[PDB]
Write a protein that binds this ligand. Structure first.
Ligand SMILES: *[C@@H]1O[C@H](CO)[C@@H](O[C@@H]2O[C@H](CO)[C@@H](O)[C@H](O)[C@H]2NC(C)=O)[C@H](O)[C@H]1NC(C)=O
Ligand SMILES: CC(C)CCC[C@@H](C)[C@H]1CC[C@H]2[C@@H]3CC=C4C[C@@H](O)CC[C@]4(C)[C@H]3CC[C@]12C
Ligand SMILES: *[C@@H]1O[C@H](CO)[C@@H](O)[C@H](O)[C@H]1NC(C)=O
Ligand SMILES: [K+]
Ligand SMILES: [K+]
Ligand SMILES: [K+]
Ligand SMILES: [Mg+2]
Lengths: 268, 39, 992
């Protein structure tokens, strides 16, 4: 033929069949032992998610949400993702004492449901009403963005203490139980309005620590609705929403490390 | 610890780099020694 | 074009002096007119040689920039700029990826260009050396007056004059001469002075006395002649053009390189476009379809391989430089290993090029002297009183002297003023009797008759050094038979005795044997003149026989030859044991050529020519079956009337071939004949008459000390110490580097698979990219470099000089067996070890292997800053990317770890590491430096930006260890099978 005879062509096939078969069987074996060394409830390493990311619902083309108020299908793209998220926080999804629980309607302290063990059933998560998100189809004019803190197993978000000076200096400082979120731009051509649990501009600490998908399915993380009823129009406004805390940090590279990058433009 | 389990989300990449560079250097020296056993 | 120059020349030495003038419109006495000479100048053109048109270095450099790998890397470099252009227009990408990767790849092409350019070097100044043989000026007779002119202004027809010490300015017809002798070594390779006279003495113009040639010099006397040829039209000017004009051609090693380039280029374009369409079918945007292709290019092309080859060659050439063997062309480092036939000059190559005493006949006994340079033999006789009598004649009846200031150099190497035979005798006595000058001071010469053409002997009368005598001793030497007709007694073991027919017959026997050995034989005799008949003041007349020259006492015979170099016989046998055929090709006479052939082992004992059979059986040569003769001796005059097909039959039908009295073109023809049969041929030589053959040879080797400038220009390799044993070393080195290149190539190729497979699974699986493009270049250009090079220092696995020369048609540098092992077996195991570490990193950060399938869509989505892992956690864009790049880093390090084992297995093709050992210090160096580089690239701060290399946790380093070990075991088991059964299965499938 090309290389060899039929007899040789066969033997080279019988070899590579057994050979690659063995190699596949060995590869699988090493994957088995790897998995055997891992927990079902907690990942081996967590230093790469460490400082929590802050992500929002409006799917930004490039950290930007520009549209026209005087146009219907101009914002119907951002309403798709906005709906996708809030559709999960339905009351019909949170039914019965299992696996949900009614928690303080005001920001409270942490809740420990034991260890990362299966020695108990599904760890009961705090309910969250999308109805706590006042004012927010969504904002056809002047968007109503929804913030979110990235989930990390066993992470206890710790707010800053009012020992020294603060950006939003001491205003509504629920020091003991709220992780604040203050959006900014100089360039003050807007109108910041925050909505959340208990009416505070933060995340209620009663939703922590997260026990993971395996130990807490259907779990709901707290949301923070933000509305920009800015009196300006037809210009790119670089708005940055920042979260503050002891376990919260940022990076010049990762522009989502505990903060937002939104470029709103109501070009109408 | 409980609420004070910050160490769980931390890794000393600084020491690791110091050690890694020490090792790389020493392996580089060892190599020179064996090569220079005759030039 | 040069087929005309490969033919024997035609001449006009047969014409009379007068007749020759009519042909050139010339005067025998007055010479040309100033006007007629200038007319002929403009007509024929200058008496000069024009160098052939060369290829500029520009075109030479750029021709490498387009050879398979460079072509693919160019397509990659441009395709980078393509994707970059498409980006800069569509969505403003502030990145530098495609732009920088395009710059990097273009640089890789340029630098790789320098390496191949350095390897494909051609240092040739043939025509320049020939031009150095034309004198600046010549002496001509114009308008009846002699004047010096620019030699280029010399034309056919003018009257030229030459004298001892000057170069022949052009081909001349000798019309007048006085004691003129010439050095024709340019045409023959033999430096013994040849007389020139107006008389025609041979039909063959290269042998006649009435022609003098350009490229030669007058050694003594004076001559006048008419110019018959000028410039390019001279006999050796044509040799110049032939030699300088010959097409170089591709080396065996070069052909091998291009061959695997085709193979690897083939699989590259195959998988390249095979997956380019496979991606579009899967609905991949052309924006991405090109990005994947660039990666495929980088994965398939072994970026650092061609440069490795060059470095391995260079390092092998450095070792040979350290044995006095200079390599002018890096590729010639390997050709000697692939050589199946050596065509060797004799004089100054196989031989020392110095008349040396070989045997002596005295006391009715043949004695042998030591002919070797360094005198590696033993003594023959010292005791016999006869010896001292013969020794005295050899010293006394000798007019040769050592040049001043030689006392530092060894006797046999020092320059001597005199003819070759007298120098030989001088050096013979000086060696075994101490200072000859002393013997010539103790015995003052009073009268002598120098060797005469008519007398055929030379005699001398000396004052006997003996005090009790202080009388007159007569000594003489000459033609053995002439000396015999002048002897009455023979000095036997001390005492004289009558010359009976018995001893006279033993003389003839001794004389015939020595002459049969191709040796020049001289007779020696002396006579103690009677005291009473010769007073202490008796005057001797040298002009008229004033003393007896008959009834003298015969002392002995001495024989001499230009002997082989000490190492030559043994080197020839070693070449022949390695299955290399050795042919002699010489300008020298057949009797001498044949005798040295037997001396060095070109013709082995018992082997006969057709002429030998005929003489032994006493039958006509036509009655001899030529197939009964494995040896042959072909004279150039017969070679001339043979067609190449008939030359091919000679080459095919004889194992032991001697081509004697060959011209320079004839040497070229013999070389081409050998090549025509498909053989790789080496030429060894030292003369300008070797230049064409040296050029045409696959590898030409010139002698460094004895070699002429031309020969060393025509060669690829120079033996700086004239050590012929270096050829044996060269062939051995050549074979070793050939095997080690295979090892180094397999090693380099093996790591291609773990660079290809990640890109494929990226498409077919939709998982995050396991390894990056930049990461690949950190391997092929970084870590693999020193290890791959180090394989060039591997010792032989067996006695390589015991095997036959490789068949260049069947035995390739890269074959299917190499690809099967590197791509199909070991590289495949490396790929898995890479993937394993990849799955380990991701799973330990929360992305278990199961959830990875079909996630790249959301993974690469820059706007999704919340991807959910297996544990329900949410990751931003840059966070997951850090883990991904950490995956690239550990996959990279996994390659390094699996290359550890590969380096050790590529060490040996057959033998076990437990047999070959770990005595390669460069290899061990490679292991340490490779690991140091990898660690540095991962842990050095800032490398996460420039190369996207991230720090690895200690446990990460050990992921591939079980795969590294399986490689070592697998290959060790496999080679155990090879050795345990030379049959073929494992062998014919995987044995590189
Ligand atoms: C989650 O809540 C949303 C609230 O808008 C539900 O949307 C409803 O969709 C139905 C049918 O398309 C409409 O008739 C209603 O007007 C919507 N609102 C309400 C309050 O009922 C959505 O269907 C819910 N999703 C799930 C899975 O239950
Ligand atoms: C990523 C995976 C799916 C690709 C696997 C590719 C396999 C099928 C390839 C890789 C190397 C290949 C082999 C390389 C060498 C030889 C020897 C040659 O004389 C015949 C073909 C043969 C035997 C090839 C057959 C196919 C082969 C085994
Ligand atoms: C939000 O909606 C409420 C009614 O639910 C209305 O009273 C109020 O004006 C709205 N706020 C703004 C800022 O438009
Ligand atoms: K490669
Ligand atoms: K050559
Ligand atoms: K490679
Ligand atoms: Mg010679």
């Amino acid at each position: 033929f090309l290389g060899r005879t039929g007899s040789s062509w066969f033997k080279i096939f019988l070899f590579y069949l057994i050979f690659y078969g063995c190699l596949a069987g060995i590869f699988i074996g090493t994957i088995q032992v790897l998995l055997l060394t891992l927990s079902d409830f907690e990942p081996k390493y967590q230093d790469r998610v460490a400082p929590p990311g802050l992500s929002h619902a409006p799917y930004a083309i490039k950290t930007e949400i520009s549209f026209s108020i005087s146009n219907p299908k101009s914002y119907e793209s951002f309403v798709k993702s906005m709906h996708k998220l809030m559709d999960l926080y339905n009351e019909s999804s949170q039914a019965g004492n299992s696996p949900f629980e009614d928690c303080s309607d005001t920001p409270a302290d942490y809740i420990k449901r034991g260890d990362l063990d299966d020695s108990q059933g599904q760890k009961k998560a705090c309910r969250f009403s999308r109805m706590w998100l006042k004012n927010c189809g969504y904002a056809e004019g002047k968007p109503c963005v929804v913030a979110k803190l990235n989930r990390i197993i066993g992470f206890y978000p710790k707010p800053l203490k009012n020992t020294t000076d603060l950006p939003e200096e001491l205003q509504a400082n629920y020091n003991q139980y709220v992780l604040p979120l203050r959006c900014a731009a100089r360039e003050k051509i807007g109108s910041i309005e925050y909505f959340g649990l208990g009416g505070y501009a933060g995340f209620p600490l009663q939703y922590y620590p997260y026990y993971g998908k395996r130990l807490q399915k259907k779990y709901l993380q707290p949301l923070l609705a933000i509305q920009f009823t800015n009196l300006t129009q037809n210009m790119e406004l670089r708005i940055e929403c920042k979260v503050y805390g002891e376990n919260i940090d940022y990076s010049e590279k990762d522009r989502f490390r505990g903060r937002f990058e939104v470029k709103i433009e109501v070009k109408s | 610890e409980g609420p004070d389990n910050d160490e769980r989300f931390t890794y000393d990449y600084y020491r690791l780099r110091v050690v890694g560079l020490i090792v790389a250097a020493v392996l580089c020296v060892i190599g020179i020694i064996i090569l220079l056993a005759g030039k | 074009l040069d087929e005309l120059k490969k033919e024997v020349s035609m001449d006009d030495h047969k014409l009379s002096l007068d007749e020759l003038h009519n042909k050139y419109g010339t005067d025998l006495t007055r010479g040309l007119t100033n006007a007629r000479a200038k007319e002929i100048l403009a007509r024929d053109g200058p008496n000069s040689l024009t160098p052939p048109p060369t290829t500029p270095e520009w075109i030479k450099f750029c021709r490498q920039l387009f050879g398979g790998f460079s072509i693919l890397l160019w397509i990659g470099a441009i395709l980078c700029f393509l994707a970059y252009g498409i980006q800069a227009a569509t969505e403003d990408e502030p990145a530098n990826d495609n732009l920088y990767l395009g710059v990097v790849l273009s640089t890789v092409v340029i630098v790789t260009g320098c390496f191949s350019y350095y390897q494909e070097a051609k240092s040739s100044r043939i025509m320049d050396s020939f031009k150095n043989m034309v004198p600046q000026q010549a002496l001509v007779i114009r308008d009846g007056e002699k004047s010096t002119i620019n030699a280029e202004f010399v034309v056919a027809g003018d009257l030229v004059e030459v004298k001892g010490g000057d170069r022949i300015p052009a081909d001349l017809r000798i019309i007048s001469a006085h004691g003129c002798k010439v050095d024709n070594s340019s045409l023959t390779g033999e430096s013994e002075p040849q007389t020139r006279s107006p008389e025609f003495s041979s039909e063959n113009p290269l042998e006649t006395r009435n022609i003098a040639f350009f490229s030669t010099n007058c050694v003594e006397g004076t001559a006048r002649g008419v110019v018959v040829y000028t410039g390019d039209r001279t006999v050796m000017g044509r040799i110049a053009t032939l030699a300088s004009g010959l097409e170089v051609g591709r080396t065996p090693i070069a052909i091998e390189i291009e061959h695997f380039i085709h193979i690897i280029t083939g699989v590259a374009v195959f998988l390249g476009v095979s997956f380019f369409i496979l991606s579009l079918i899967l609905g991949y945007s052309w924006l991405e379809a090109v990005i994947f292709l660039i990666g495929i290019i980088v994965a398939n092309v072994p970026e650092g391989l061609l440069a490795t080859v060059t470095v391995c060659l260079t390092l092998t050439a450095k070792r040979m430089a350290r044995k006095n063997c200079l390599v002018k062309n890096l590729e010639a480092v390997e050709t000697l290993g692939s050589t199946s036939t050596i065509c060797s000059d004799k004089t100054g190559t196989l031989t020392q090029n110095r008349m040396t005493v070989a045997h002596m006949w005295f006391d009715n006994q043949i004695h042998e002297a030591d002919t070797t340079e360094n005198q590696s033999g033993a003594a023959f006789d010292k005791t016999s009183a006869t010896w001292s009598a013969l020794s005295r004649i050899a010293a006394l009846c000798n007019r040769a002297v050592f040049q001043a200031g030689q006392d530092n150099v060894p006797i046999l190497k020092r320059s001597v003023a005199g003819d070759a035979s007298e120098s030989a005798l001088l050096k013979c006595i000086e060696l075994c009797c101490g200072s000859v000058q002393g013997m010539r001071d103790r015995n003052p010469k009073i009268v002598e008759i120098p060797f005469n053409s008519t007398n055929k002997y030379q005699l001398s009368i000396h004052e006997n050094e003996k005090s009790s005598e202080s009388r007159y001793l007569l000594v003489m030497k000459g033609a053995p038979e002439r000396i015999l007709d002048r002897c009455s007694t023979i000095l036997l073991n001390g005492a004289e005795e009558p010359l009976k027919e018995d001893m006279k017959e033993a003389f003839q026997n001794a004389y015939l044997e020595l002459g049969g050995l191709g040796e020049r034989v001289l007779g020696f005799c002396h006579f103690a003149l009677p005291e009473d008949k010769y007073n202490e003041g008796y005057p001797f007349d040298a002009d008229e026989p004033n003393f007896p020259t008959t009834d003298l006492c015969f002392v002995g015979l001495m024989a001499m030859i230009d002997p082989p170099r000490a190492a030559v016989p043994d080197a020839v046998g070693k070449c022949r044991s390695a299955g290399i055929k050795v042919i002699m090709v010489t300008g020298d006479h057949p009797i001498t050529a044949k005798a040295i052939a037997k001396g060095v082992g070109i013709i082995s004992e018992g082997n006969e020519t057709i002429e030998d059979i005929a003489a032994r059986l006493n039958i006509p040569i036509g009655q001899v079956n030529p197939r009964d003769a494995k040896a042959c001796v072909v004279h150039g005059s017969d070679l001339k009337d043979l067609s190449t097909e008939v030359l091919d039959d000679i080459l095919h039908y004889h194992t032991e071939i001697v081509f004697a009295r060959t011209s320079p073109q004839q040497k070229l023809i013999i070389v081409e004949g050998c090549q025509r049969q498909g053989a790789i041929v080496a030429v060894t030589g030292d003369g300008v008459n070797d230049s064409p053959a040296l050029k045409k040879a696959d590898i030409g080797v010139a002698m460094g000390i004895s070699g002429s400038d031309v020969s060393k220009q025509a060669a690829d390799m120079i033996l700086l110490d004239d050590n012929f044993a270096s050829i044996v070393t060269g062939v051995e080195e050549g074979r070793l580097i050939f095997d080690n290149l295979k090892k180094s190539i397999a090693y380099t190729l093996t790591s291609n698979i773990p660079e290809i497979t990640p890109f494929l699974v990226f498409i077919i699986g939709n998982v995050p990219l396991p390894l990056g493009t930049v990461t690949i270049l950190c391997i092929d250009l970084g870590t693999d470099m020193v290890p791959a090079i180090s394989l060039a220092y591997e010792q032989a696995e067996s006695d390589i000089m015991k095997r036959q020369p490789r068949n260049p048609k069947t035995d390739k540098l890269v074959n299917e067996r190499l690809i099967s092992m590197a791509y199909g077996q070991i590289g495949m195991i490396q790929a898995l070890g890479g993937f394993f570490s990849y799955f380990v990193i991701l799973a330990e950060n929360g992305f278990l292997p199961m959830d990875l399938i079909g996630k790249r869509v959301r993974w690469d989505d820059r706007w999704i800053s919340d991807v959910e892992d297996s544990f329900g956690q949410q990751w931003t864009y840059e966070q997951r990317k850090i883990v991904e790049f950490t995956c690239h880093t550990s996959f990279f390090i996994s390659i390094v770890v699996v290359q550890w084992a590969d380096l050790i297995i590529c060490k040996t093709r057959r033998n076990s590491i437990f047999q070959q050992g770990m005595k390669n210090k460069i290899l061990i160096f490679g292991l340490f430096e490779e690991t140091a580089l990898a660690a540095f690239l991962s842990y050095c701060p800032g490398t996460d930006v420039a190369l996207r290399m991230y720090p690895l946790k200690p446990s990460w380093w050990f992921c591939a260890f079980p795969y590294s070990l399986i490689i070592f075991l697998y290959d060790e088991m496999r080679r155990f099978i090879i050795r345990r059964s030379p049959g073929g299965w494992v062998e014919q499938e995987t044995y590189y």
